[PDB]
């Protein structure tokens, strides 16, 4: 059953994380351009997850330690009490940095797996 769409916006991040699959789910050339836009915008975000090892996971935990240079809160009391839009307005300053760390971490794991199984 269709659960609507985007309804978890404005709620605490803790509650919104259980509806991720809702958001994840012909006037000629203009309409075709819209279709290609949708396809490529999905493929970009879906490839950007494979590089980090989270190939098919909505929620993924990865090996890159946090530090206070980026956004810093007591995120056990402020994990909730914060809402996704405000969070993005908070941490949008440092994503371009986090992506490289995640990429290098994934490369490390793949190289390690390739080397270790040489003994098997």
């Amino acid at each position: 059953v269709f659960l609507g769409f985007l309804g978890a916006a404005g709620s605490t991040m803790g509650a919104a994380s259980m509806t991720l699959t809702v958001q994840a789910r012909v006037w000629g050339i203009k309409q075709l351009q819209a279709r290609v836009l949708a396809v490529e915008r999905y493929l970009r975000d879906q490839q950007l997850l494979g590089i980090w090892g989270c190939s098919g996971k909505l929620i993924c935990c990865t090996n890159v330690p946090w530090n206070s240079s980026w956004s810093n809160r007591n995120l056990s009391e402020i994990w909730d009490n914060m809402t996704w839009l405000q969070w993005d307005k908070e941490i949008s300053n440092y994503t371009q940095i986090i992506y490289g760390l995640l990429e290098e971490s994934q490369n490390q794991q793949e190289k390690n797996e390739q080397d270790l199984l040489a003994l098997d």
Binding site: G4, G7, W27, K30, D45, G53, C61, P65, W66, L75
Partner: protein, 452 residues
């Protein structure tokens, strides 16, 4: 300590951005056997239901006076006329000199506003030309600078005229605007939202409600009604360059009729092309007129003055009639029954106010015109073929496109007449906004990935 990155997908977050919006239409297509009216010809993804899903706690900004959707609406509205006039007959062969005289209705009574023209035109055989005749309104004709009996079509010395195909009769079929996959069309539900500033009751939809692509100049007829009381909108009410869109919560009925009858006649221009001129006029001499319930108009102008002086409580408010000039800008216009009207609205905007229903109907006499220099374009025109039989029209006024003048006195001024045609559609798309979802996020948590 012990906090590591974790990446979420499907995060519900968004950011404003312009995008290419679908063009849709009701599955109830063109009623006359789907003979390719513009909305049915191309824009026909069938009736995407607006599954509105309220958002619990969102606070979102809106700005109607600079939104992305109005420009797309205007471009589509202009363009869909070109795609429908392309195959119709060009009237270039008809821009010949005319020998024209006065017309006469029954009993040889001179019918003011018409002229019986005759001209030479080439028949099916390109070596033979004959003398035909037709009746043109005085507004489709410009007297040649010479003998008083020589005339020429008003528009055929600047651009190329094209007759409108009778089989594609234009009509305000509602149009639904839907964002493509990935985007989302928000909107505001605050029923007293003044067109700008944040709304605390946002909600999303697959598409906008049916939006009528009406064309008019000063009365935003057949529109949608506000849910509260009369609302006033402007980017800056004080500044005169901005149209003061008044929105009515009370519809005021208006009628307009053309009692005369028209004799449509066919003049052949060449191979397979027909030109529908106007022959003899049937019925007695009249001028097309419009009616308004004077009680309702008195009440509505009282209400608009009441709401408007809340921004100027220390001033009297004086409405004024249209200044003057081309009929294209000084007269309430519309396209009832396939023939364009041009109404004088001086009698409706002369009431004044100080500081501190089937009766007395008002009448206003409306010109009629055939060769339209369509508002949608400059440097090209169109010809509206005559419509047989008398035409009656009923519609609901739901707004005023006022604008304030600089009167010498210290009190306020407001006269009809908008400065641009975009305000017609900015009275429907003042709710909506279009955003792009960015479902990838990163946050810290108490987890690190497994090593195996």
């Amino acid at each position: 300590e012990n906090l590591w990155v974790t990446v979420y997908y499907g995060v519900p977050v968004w950011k404003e951005a312009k995008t290419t919006l679908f063009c849709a239409s009701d599955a109830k297509a063109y009623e006359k056997e789907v003979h390719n009216v513009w909305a049915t010809h191309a824009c026909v993804p069938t009736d995407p239901n607006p599954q509105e899903m309220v958002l619990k706690n969102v606070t979102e900004n809106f700005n109607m006076w600079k939104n992305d959707m109005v420009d797309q609406m205007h471009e589509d509205v202009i363009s869909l006329w070109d795609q429908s006039l392309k195959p119709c007959v060009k009237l270039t062969p008809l821009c010949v000199t005319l020998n024209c005289t006065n017309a006469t209705a029954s009993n040889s009574s001179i019918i003011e506003g018409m002229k019986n023209c005759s001209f030479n035109i080439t028949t099916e055989l390109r070596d033979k030309r004959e003398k035909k005749n037709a009746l043109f309104y005085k507004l489709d004709i410009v007297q040649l600078d010479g003998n008083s009996s020589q005339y020429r079509l008003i528009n055929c010395n600047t651009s190329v005229i094209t007759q409108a195909c009778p089989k594609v009769s234009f009509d305000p079929i509602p149009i639904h605007y839907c964002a493509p996959a990935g985007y989302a069309i928000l909107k505001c539900n605050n029923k007293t939202f003044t067109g700008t500033g944040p709304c605390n009751n946002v909600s999303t939809v697959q598409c906008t409600h049916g939006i009528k692509p009406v064309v008019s100049t000063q009365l935003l007829l057949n529109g949608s009604l506000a849910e509260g009381e009369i609302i006033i909108r402007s980017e800056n009410i004080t500044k005169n360059v901005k149209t003061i869109i008044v929105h009515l919560n009370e519809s005021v009925k208006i009628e307009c009729t053309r009692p005369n009858n028209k004799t449509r006649t066919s003049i052949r221009i060449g191979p397979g092309q027909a030109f529908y001129a106007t022959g003899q006029v049937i019925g007695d001499i009249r001028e097309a007129y419009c009616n308004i319930n004077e009680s309702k108009w008195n009440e509505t102008l009282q209400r608009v003055s009441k709401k408007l002086k809340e921004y100027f409580p220390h001033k009297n408010i004086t409405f004024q009639p249209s200044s003057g000039g081309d009929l294209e800008i000084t007269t309430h216009s519309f396209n009832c029954g396939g023939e364009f009207f041009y109404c004088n609205t001086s009698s409706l905007f002369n009431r004044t106010y100080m500081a501190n229903n089937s009766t007395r109907t008002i009448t206003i006499h409306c010109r009629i015109k055939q060769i339209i220099n369509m508002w949608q374009e400059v440097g090209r025109a169109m010809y509206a073929p005559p419509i047989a039989g008398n035409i009656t029209c009923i519609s609901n006024i739901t707004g005023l496109l006022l604008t304030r003048c600089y009167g010498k006195n210290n009190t306020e001024c407001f006269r009809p007449g908008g400065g641009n045609m975009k305000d017609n559609w900015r009275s429907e798309l003042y709710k909506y906004k279009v955003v792009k979802i960015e479902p990838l996020g990163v946050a810290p948590t108490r987890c690190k990935r497994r090593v195996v």
